[PDB]
Amino acid sequence: GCRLRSQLVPVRALGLGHRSDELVRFRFCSGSCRRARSPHDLSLASLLGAGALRPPPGSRPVSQPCCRPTRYEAVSFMDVNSTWRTVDRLSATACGC
Protein backbone atom coordinates (compact mmCIF):
# COMPACT_ATOMS: atom_id res chain seq x y z
CA GLY A 1 0.00 0.00 0.00
CA CYS A 2 0.99 3.69 -0.48
CA ARG A 3 3.40 4.65 2.32
CA LEU A 4 6.39 6.76 3.20
CA ARG A 5 9.79 5.18 2.44
CA SER A 6 13.05 6.39 3.91
CA GLN A 7 16.58 5.77 2.49
CA LEU A 8 20.16 7.18 2.79
CA VAL A 9 21.55 8.99 -0.30
CA PRO A 10 24.53 11.14 -1.46
CA VAL A 11 23.61 14.86 -1.58
CA ARG A 12 25.12 15.27 -5.06
CA ALA A 13 22.52 12.82 -6.33
CA LEU A 14 19.83 15.29 -5.19
CA GLY A 15 20.46 17.28 -8.42
CA LEU A 16 21.13 20.85 -7.17
CA GLY A 17 24.90 21.11 -7.50
CA HIS A 18 25.71 20.61 -3.79
CA ARG A 19 28.50 18.41 -2.41
CA SER A 20 28.79 16.78 1.04
CA ASP A 21 30.62 13.88 2.74
CA GLU A 22 27.46 13.21 4.80
CA LEU A 23 24.72 10.94 3.54
CA VAL A 24 21.21 12.37 3.94
CA ARG A 25 17.89 10.63 4.61
CA PHE A 26 15.54 11.19 1.71
CA ARG A 27 11.92 10.12 2.09
CA PHE A 28 9.44 9.52 -0.68
CA CYS A 29 6.08 7.90 -1.33
CA SER A 30 5.35 4.63 -3.13
CA GLY A 31 2.95 1.70 -3.24
CA SER A 32 -0.52 0.79 -4.39
CA CYS A 33 -3.66 2.92 -4.27
CA ARG A 34 -5.88 0.26 -5.85
CA ARG A 35 -8.17 0.15 -2.81
CA ALA A 36 -8.84 3.87 -3.28
CA ARG A 37 -10.36 3.83 -6.82
CA SER A 38 -13.29 6.19 -7.48
CA PRO A 39 -16.28 5.08 -9.58
CA HIS A 40 -14.58 6.77 -12.58
CA ASP A 41 -11.32 4.87 -11.88
CA LEU A 42 -13.20 1.57 -11.69
CA SER A 43 -14.98 2.23 -14.98
CA LEU A 44 -11.71 3.38 -16.62
CA ALA A 45 -9.92 0.20 -15.40
CA SER A 46 -12.83 -1.88 -16.65
CA LEU A 47 -12.76 -0.21 -20.11
CA LEU A 48 -8.94 -0.67 -20.47
CA GLY A 49 -9.22 -4.28 -19.27
CA ALA A 50 -11.95 -4.95 -21.86
CA GLY A 51 -9.80 -3.28 -24.55
CA ALA A 52 -12.63 -0.77 -25.16
CA LEU A 53 -10.29 2.28 -25.28
CA ARG A 54 -7.63 3.04 -27.87
CA PRO A 55 -4.34 4.23 -26.30
CA PRO A 56 -3.93 8.02 -26.24
CA PRO A 57 -0.78 9.82 -27.44
CA GLY A 58 2.04 9.38 -24.93
CA SER A 59 1.62 7.71 -21.57
CA ARG A 60 -1.23 5.36 -20.59
CA PRO A 61 -3.93 6.77 -18.28
CA VAL A 62 -3.57 5.69 -14.65
CA SER A 63 -6.72 3.98 -13.40
CA GLN A 64 -6.10 4.56 -9.65
CA PRO A 65 -4.76 7.40 -7.52
CA CYS A 66 -1.00 7.89 -7.43
CA CYS A 67 0.84 7.51 -4.16
CA ARG A 68 2.14 11.05 -3.71
CA PRO A 69 3.58 13.20 -0.95
CA THR A 70 1.21 15.55 0.81
CA ARG A 71 3.77 17.29 3.08
CA TYR A 72 7.50 18.11 2.95
CA GLU A 73 10.56 19.01 5.07
CA ALA A 74 14.04 20.39 4.29
CA VAL A 75 17.13 18.35 3.74
CA SER A 76 20.21 19.51 5.71
CA PHE A 77 23.91 18.64 5.59
CA MET A 78 27.46 19.91 6.17
CA ASP A 79 28.79 20.72 2.66
CA VAL A 80 32.42 20.01 1.61
CA ASN A 81 33.36 23.49 2.86
CA SER A 82 31.90 22.35 6.29
CA THR A 83 29.22 25.03 5.98
CA TRP A 84 25.74 23.97 6.98
CA ARG A 85 23.24 23.97 4.12
CA THR A 86 19.47 23.45 4.01
CA VAL A 87 17.26 22.94 0.96
CA ASP A 88 13.55 23.62 1.37
CA ARG A 89 10.74 21.11 0.77
CA LEU A 90 12.89 18.34 -0.66
CA SER A 91 11.87 15.34 1.46
CA ALA A 92 8.37 13.84 1.94
CA THR A 93 6.88 13.65 5.44
CA ALA A 94 3.39 12.28 4.55
CA CYS A 95 1.86 10.39 1.65
CA GLY A 96 -1.66 9.96 0.32
CA CYS A 97 -3.61 8.30 -2.46
Contact residues: a copy of itself, CB under 8 A: 5, 7, 9-10, 13-16, 26, 28-32, 38-40, 42-47, 50, 52-54, 56-62, 65-69, 72, 75, 87-92
Question: Minimum distance from CB of 9 to a copy of itself (Å)?
Answer: 5
Residue nearer to a copy of itself on the CB measure, 10 or 85: 10
The Cα angle at residue 60 between residues 54 and 62, in degrees rounded to 5: 115
Residue nearer to a copy of itself on the CB measure, 21 or 61: 61
Local structure of 72: helix, strand or coil: strand
- Least Cα distance to 30 among 69, 2, 72 occurs for 2
Residue nearer to a copy of itself on the CB measure, 74 or 80: 74
